[PDB]
Design a binder for these strands. Sequence first.
DNA 1: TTAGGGTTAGGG
DNA 2: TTAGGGTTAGGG
Lengths: 179, 179
Amino acid sequence: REKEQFRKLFIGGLSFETTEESLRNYYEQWGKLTDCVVMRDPASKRSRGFGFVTFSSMAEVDAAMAARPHSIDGRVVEPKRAVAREESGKPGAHVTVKKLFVGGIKEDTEEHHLRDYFEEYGKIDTIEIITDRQSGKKRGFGFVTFDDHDPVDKIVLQKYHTINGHNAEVRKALSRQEM
Amino acid sequence: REKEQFRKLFIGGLSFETTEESLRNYYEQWGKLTDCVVMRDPASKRSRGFGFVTFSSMAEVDAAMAARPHSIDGRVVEPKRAVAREESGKPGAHVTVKKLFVGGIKEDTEEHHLRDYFEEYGKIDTIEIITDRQSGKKRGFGFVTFDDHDPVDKIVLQKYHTINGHNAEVRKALSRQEM
DNA sequence: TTAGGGTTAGGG
DNA sequence: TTAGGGTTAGGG
């Protein structure tokens, strides 16, 4: 079994009335939780408006995310795969995006190669293989845009992927302003 | 005089036809350049669509920025105070925003203290001193929003500022998702 | 060398 | 202790 970090969801935008009890009761519909916490101001004990749930298996996490949208105590919340504390301070660590950078694919990787690899993770809206506008050559990287952020979030938990005969690398796609 | 880094403008969105010669001819309207470069791909020599100019003094940089918008070889460009290479990899290093975070101002700093200190850098739109919503207590930081990004860019070239008798710290303002 | 995009972070 | 905002990044 994977360690808890890979079975854990960040639950954003909680109603300030939601409690560990009501958060647990909601996410238990997809399986047993090994942890559940609503984060609170230590001084006032007021809710900070988010928390975490940790399922007993990866399959349970996926089932919960497959059943979005989630409404708890009368507010629609935003569950996300938990980004590890060690990523704090990295550009884009907590940005939610639908686009993935793929590097290391050299000059023989075409759009369909990326599609064949990534389509099992989720619905793909577009793929871009970057080329040099003057030489025409492939530049050895591309982007995959999904219809939802969750495939990106899951994919980037594994940095290195074997694609089209290459040791490729994935990164969450960041705009110029974010990089 | 100041080091070149503080006399330097990043010029974003260049026409791909702009050359060092045409970039220089444009910016020399405001003073003599000690440096001018159009950045290119090392393999193909295609323009990357940006460059730098460095003026002989800080006053000349200010004069150029006071004369925006700038159009060069038929394209409107975006000049920006240059962000040092050493900032690469920090969240928000290259963000362009009108809003400034001000920390370290404790519980006795009011809007007018920030207005009095910052108004010399440019036109101020709004000032917010942040308080705890329930208690009303000042939380020791605030935000200054200007009508343009350039005052922010200039201000954050100096991290530490004395404000209302405090050692304060300034940061470009980021959304929570970017931190 | 593996950060685009007509979206804009560094050569010498 | 110095990251807001009904704006959502961690305590045990």
